[PDB]
Structure 1
C-alpha cells in the first residue's frame, strides 16, 4: 500500500525538474536497455514534475482553489502521482514492470485529457461565485502559464515513452520529426483552416509562402521539431488571420492573401504570418494572451513556442492588418525544455496585495 499523497508531494517537490533538449529526446533508443533507462528516469522525473506543479496549485487564492473544477484537476494529479508511486519498488529487469508502466502512463494521459477546459471552467467558477479581482487575476495569469507549460512537458515525456516503446512515421522518434519540412506543416495548417473559413464564409484568402534560407538559398527549410505542436500554433494563427481578412472585406469579392515567410538564420527559425485583416488597436493586444479576457488558443499556442525556448509574438497595425511571428530555435541543441520550478522565487509571485501601482 502507499503513503498518503502529501508525503510524496513534499518529497518530490524538493527536486527541480530536469529539462531535456530536443537532441537528447532524439538520441533516445528503443531497445530493452533503453526502455529500462526510460522507466528508471520517468519513475523519478514524472513524480518530480507532478509534485512541483501541485505545490504551486496550493498557492492560488483560496477563491480559485475552492472551485469544484480546480479541485477536480488537483484530484487527478494526486491519483496520477500515486499511480507512479506503485512503481517505486518494482524491478526494471522484469518485463512485466515495463509493460505495466506503459499501461499506467496511458491511463494517466487519458485521465488528464480534458485538463485545459476543466481548468478554464474553474476560472469561470471563480468569476461567477466571487466576481473577479485584479490581484487574483494576476496570480491566475502567472499560474496558468506555468501550469499549462508544465502539462505540455509531462505530456511530452509520456508521449515519447508510449510512442517509442509501444506506424506511418517510423523515421519519427516518438512524436519528434528529425526532418520536419516547415513549409509542409504551414500548408497543412492552412488547408485545415481554409476548410473552416470556407464553411462559414464561403470564401477564404489564398496562401503565399516565401522561404529565406540565409546560409543555403536553394535548400528547403527543415528542422528537428514536434510537427503537431507547430501545426497547432499555425492552425490557430491561420484561423485568426482568415477570419479578420474576410470580416474586414465584407464588400469585396477579392480577398488579400495571407503571406507567410519562413526564415532560417544561424540561431532562429522564424515564421511570420502577415494578413491585411484590418488590425487591432495595441490596447487590445495584451488581452489576446489573457486567460481572463477569455478561447485559450493563443495563450496555449505561445506556450508551445516557449516550451523549446521559442516565442509567439503579435504586432498589429490598426486600420491595416496584423503580423504574427513564431520564433523557434534553429538547432536541436538549443531547443531545451522550458520548465517552471517550485521555489522561493516562484512562491513570492503569489504573495501580492492590492495597492496603488508604481505609475500615475
Structure 2
C-alpha cells in the first residue's frame, strides 16, 4: 500500500510538554496545528498500520484485526484529503476539526476488539510463552501509538473550537497531584462499596523535598494520571477486602506523593495479602488478562496504565510481599522539559 508506504517512511516526531503548551497558548496557532497534524497524523497512522501488516497471516486475517485495520485505513484516507487544502480558509480548519472527531469516535471500540482477537488466538493457537511475548510486544506498541494519536487529536479539538484558559486541552500546567489521587480514590471507593458493602480508607502523605511546605503540583495530563490511580485503587481495594473476610477492620490504602529533582513518584500501598514474586509479571500480560466481572483483575487496565506512565517517559512498577501486601509506584518526570512523548518507531530492528 503506497499511501501507507509513503508516510511510513517518516518517523513520528515526539513532542515535549512545553511544545504542547505552546500549540494551545493561542487561538492564532490553529493554522500551525493543522499544517502540523495533517502531516504528523498520517505518519503515526501509517507507522502502526505497517506494523499491523507485519503480523503473521494467521493473526492478520482474523476478523478483529481486519476490522481494526479497516478503521486505520479509513482514518488515513480522511486526513490525506486535507493535504492539498489551504490553511487560510476557515472552512478548511473547521472541517479539519470535524474530521478529527469522526476519526476519534470510529476507533472508540479498539480495546475490546483487540481483546476479542487475543481470545481467539488463545483458543485457536494456544497460550504458550512465545505467543505471550509477541502479543505483549505488539499490543504495548499498538496501544502506546493509539494513546499518542489520541493525545494529538484531543489537543487540537479541545483547544480550537471557538478565551485564555488555565487548562490547555488535556494538559493541566498546575496539576494538584493529591487532588487527583483523592478523586480516583473516591470513585473506586464508590464501586467497592457497591460490590462489597465496605471499603478501605485513604491516607495521603506528601514529601516535597526541595520545599517541604508546598503542595505538590506538576505539568501533566490529569485524565491519564486519574486512569492509572483509579485502576490501581480498584486492585488495592479488591485485594484488601477479599483478604480480610474474617477481620472487622479493613487496613487503609496509603499513598505517598514524593517530589524530587527528576522524579515525581506516587506510591500506593495495600495490606491485601500480596502475591508471590513469580506471579507479578503475568498481571501485566494481555494474554493472561483475557478471558471469556470482579472489581479488578480482568481486562487491560493494569498494562494500559503502565503505558500511560511510559508515554511521557515515566514508569509503573509493582512490588509485593506475599503474606502482607503490595506497593505500586507511578514514576513521572518532575520537569516539563523532560516530559517528552514516547512513541513506538517502525525501524528495521522492529
Normalised by the shorter chain, which TM-score bucket? over 0.9
Distance 1:161 1:243, change over 3 A: same
Superposed displacement of residue 220, structure 1: 0.2
Superposed displacement of residue 69, structure 1: 0.6
Q: What CA deviation, in whole Å up to 9, does each residue of 1:290-347 have, x standing for no partner? A: 00001101000000000000000000000000000000000111000000000111xx
* CA-atom RMSD in angstroms: 2.1
Q: 1:302 aligns with which of 306, 313, 319?
A: 306
* Count of residue pairs the alignment pairs up: 341
Q: What CA deviation, in whole Å up to 9, does each residue of 1:152-211 have, x standing for no partner? A: 000000000000001999310001000000000000000000001111111111100000
CA distance in 1, matches of 2:220, 2:7: 30
CA distance in 1, matches of 2:154, 2:25: 14
Counterpart contact for 1:60–1:139, Cα < 8 Å: no
Distance 1:167 1:202, change over 3 A: farther
CA distance in 2, matches of 1:134, 1:214: 43
Superposed displacement of residue 66, structure 1: 1.8
Match of 1:319 in 2: 323
CA distance in 2, matches of 1:133, 1:81: 35
CA distance in 2, matches of 1:168, 1:249: 52
Q: If the length of structure 1 is used for normalisation, what is the TM-score?
A: 0.92
Superposed displacement of residue 246, structure 1: 0.8
Distance 1:90 1:167, change over 3 A: closer
Gap runs ≥5 in structure 2: 290-298
Q: What CA deviation, in whole Å up to 9, does each residue of 1:194-241 have, x standing for no partner? A: 001111111111100000000000000000011100000000000000
Counterpart contact for 2:24–2:155, Cα < 8 Å: no
Superposed displacement of residue 12, structure 1: 0.3
Gap runs ≥5 in structure 1: 1-5, 346-359
Superposed displacement of residue 32, structure 1: 5.3
Distance 1:32 1:182, change over 3 A: closer
Q: What CA deviation, in whole Å up to 9, does each residue of 1:234-256 have, x standing for no partner? A: 00000000111111110111111
Counterpart contact for 1:146–1:340, Cα < 8 Å: yes
1:218 alignment partner, SS class: coil
1:30 alignment partner, SS class: coil
CA distance in 1, matches of 2:127, 2:325: 32
CA distance in 2, matches of 1:289, 1:150: 18
Superposed displacement of residue 137, structure 1: 2.7
Superposed displacement of residue 124, structure 1: 1.0
